[PDB]
Amino acid sequence: DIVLTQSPASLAVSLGQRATISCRASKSVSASVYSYMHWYQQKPGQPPKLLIYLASSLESGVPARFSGSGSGTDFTLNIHPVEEEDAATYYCHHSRELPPAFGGGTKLEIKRADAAPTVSIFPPSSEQLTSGGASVVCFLNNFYPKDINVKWKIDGSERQNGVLNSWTDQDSKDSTYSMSSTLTLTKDEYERHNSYTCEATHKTSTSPIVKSFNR
Amino acid sequence: QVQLQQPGAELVRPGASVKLSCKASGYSFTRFWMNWVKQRPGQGLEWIGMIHPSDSETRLNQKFKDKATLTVDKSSTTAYMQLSSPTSEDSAVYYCARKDYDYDAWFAYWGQGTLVTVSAAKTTPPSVYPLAPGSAAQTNSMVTLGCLVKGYFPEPVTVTWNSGSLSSGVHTFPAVLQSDLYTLSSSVTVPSSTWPSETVTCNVAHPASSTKVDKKI
C-alpha cells in the first residue's frame, strides 16, 4: 500500500516562529489534480481532530495559523505563528489506496527559556502507617527542559530502591514540565530512620536543590 | 449533534476474547460506515478495520486479520468489534470513527476511547492517602498539597480536587506500573491565604472498579 513517514519525530519551536513538519508517502496519493491527505492533531488523553484536508484546504473552525502544502509524495505542515496551545502530536493520513494507514507521528513542543523546579516533599500519611506501609513522596513542578534527576537520601545515605518516577507532558499555558518521585518503604524502615532528603539535579542549578524533613 | 460512545476501559487475560461497543447517535446509523483505530502509547495510531453496517461487509487489515471480528446492530444504532487472543502488544486505546465522504474521505467524529489492558491480574480497588507537609520554613507564600493513589488495577483513575472545584494549579501525574499494580500521584498549589480558609479534599474515582474514594488533606 502507501506508507507514510513523518520527519522529524519530535520538534521544538519557540513562540512566534514557524513549525514545519513533513509527511512523505511511499506512493503518489494525487488523483485528478486533487491529492489525498488529511492532517490530524491529537493532544494527550484525547482523540485526534482533522485540520487540513486535501493538503491545500483549512477546515472550518480550525484557526488560520495552521496550513499545509505539497504535491505528489512530499507534503508539509506549516504552522505560523506558533502558539502555546499548538503543542500536540501531529499525524497524516492517505485515502488513496487500501488499506488506509496513519503516519508515524510527530510531537511539537514549545521552546522557551529554562526554568528551575519547585521541590516539595510530603511525608507519608498516618493512614498509610496504619496499614503497615509508608511512602515518602517528592513533587517537582514548573521546570524546563524535561531533563532532570531526582536523588533520594535517607539519613545522609542514598537509596535508589523503591523509587517510582512519573513525568508529565508539556503544560499548555505555562509551557513547563512537572514530575514526582515516590519512595516506598515499610513502617519498620520508617521508624528506624529519621532524615528523609529529596534532591533535584537540573541544568539550571550546578548543585542539587536540597529539600528534606525530619521524622 | 453526532456522537460516538464507548466504554471507559476493559480488562482481558492473554488468549481470551472481548467485545467492544461503539454507540452512534445524532445521525442514521445505516447511512455511514464504521471504522476502527488502534493507538498504543508511543506507537501512534494504527488502522484496524472498516465495516458496512447494512450488509455487515467487513474489510480488515492483514495485521488484524483473524484477530478482529466486526459486527453491527442496526436496531440499537451500535457497532461492535470482537478481538480474539490479545497479546502484550495488543494493549492500547481503541477508537471508532465515522468516515465523512466528500471526495477525499476524512474522519469527522471520534469515539470516547477504550483502554484494553492485557494482563492476568485481577481488578484491585484503589487505596488513596492524603499528603500534607505538616512543616515548613515559611520561605514561600504558596502552599502546595498532594494526594497519593496507590494499589489499583487497571488504569486509568480519575483524580480531582474538591470534586473538581479547583481547576487551576492542579497537576494529575500519570500512573506507574510496579508489582502488577499501578500508582499515580497528584498535586495542587494554592496561596497561603487559601489553605487555612478553604478545605482541600482529594476526590478519586476508579472507572474499572466503579469505586469512589474521598480523602481530606
Author numbering:
A (entry chain E): 1 to 215
B (entry chain D): 1 to 217
From the publication, what sentences describe this entry?
The ectodomain of the S protein consists of a receptor-binding subunit termed S1 and a membrane-fusion subunit termed S2. The S protein of SARS-CoV-2 forms homotrimers on the virion surface and likely exists in two major states, namely the “closed” state with three RBD down (receptor-inaccessible) and the “open” state with one RBD up (receptor-accessible). By using a combination of biochemical, virological, and cryo-EM structural analyses, we identify three types of cross-variant neutralizing MAbs, represented by S5D2, S5G2, and S3H3, respectively, and further define their epitopes.
The SD1 region targeted by S3H3 is an evolutionarily stable region among SARS-CoV-2 strains, whereas it differs significantly from those of other human betacoronaviruses. Mutations occurring in the SARS-CoV-2 B.1.1.7, B.1.351, B.1.617.1, and B.1.617.2 variant S proteins relative to the WT S are not present in the S3H3-SD1 interaction interface. Thus, these mutations will not affect S3H3 binding, explaining the observed broad-spectrum SARS-CoV-2 neutralization potency of S3H3 Mab. S3H3 does not block ACE2 binding to S trimer. Our structural analysis showed that S3H3 binding tightens the B.1.351 S trimer with its RBD-1 in a transition state between “open” and “closed” configuration, inferring that S3H3 may inhibit viral entry by locking the fusion machinery in the prefusion state and/or by affecting RBM exposure to cellular ACE2 receptor.
